[PDB]
Amino acid sequence: IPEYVDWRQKGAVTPVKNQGSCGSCWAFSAVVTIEGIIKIRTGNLNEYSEQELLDCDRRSYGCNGGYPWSALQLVAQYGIHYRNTYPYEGVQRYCRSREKGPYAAKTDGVRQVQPYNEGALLYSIANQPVSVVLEAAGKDFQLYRGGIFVGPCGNKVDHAVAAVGYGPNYILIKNSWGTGWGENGYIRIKRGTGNSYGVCGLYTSSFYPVKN
Amino acid sequence: ALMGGIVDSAEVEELARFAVDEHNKKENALLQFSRLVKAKQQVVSGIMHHLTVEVIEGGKKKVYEAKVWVQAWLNSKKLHEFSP
């Protein structure tokens, strides 16, 4: 695979978002991957609705947490609307997908990257943005100011984000905490340390959308 | 495990104390922070601490649930919710 990958340079990543006080990261993570595969498959970069997934994924728990995989399954089943037609409110409301009109985009499936495998993850990142998880509760992660992050951090994952690239010594991650955190909202997390959990448990659970 | 979910310290103790002082300030209340009975944290944009705290209200012990929203990088700390 290439030595460096950065989907932002390929026009496949929209502006950094802020999930606020709601535990909706799983939806934000899913959305980044949908925005990415759609740009990759159709040539167009669009913004999709995290709120829609927040309100409509009955397997997830609204602002109390959720799953990137069920959100992605939802998009494969019913499609997703544009973010501007279904804007973020930071609180879960009732599902109003059918109140909007035809979906904006639809995927064909969901695949999981073999876990605890750094090479498999990079391989998939080379193909498209991937939803990944990590432990972000630690103070160091919270205060991240830039550079290639090594922690310290455990592997009890608690946050979903999106890997949109990588390099010889890091994996490039788009976080959902606004542009005032990290490197204008992104984090470069150290890779290649021989830790199969991945730094902060980064290799624990990665999924990506399939689009014929 | 739920990503962004609620899961079960010196800093946490001060956040609990912070919640009670913040509540007293906003409501002109006189709650006396007695102790942190239980604590859970949730990753959001930053961290949402779900603190179960015992206070003294009019000489009587009472337990409240406080949600304190911390965004460390912004030096921000907010009392998000407070109720029995």
UniProtKB/TrEMBL annotation, chain B:
User: What highest taxon heads this organism's lineage?
Assistant: Eukaryota
Name recorded for this polypeptide: Cysteine proteinase inhibitor
To which protein family does this belong?
Answer: Belongs to the cystatin family. Phytocystatin subfamily.
Identify the segment of the full-length protein shown. 2 to 91 of 205
Give start and end of each Cystatin domain: 1-84
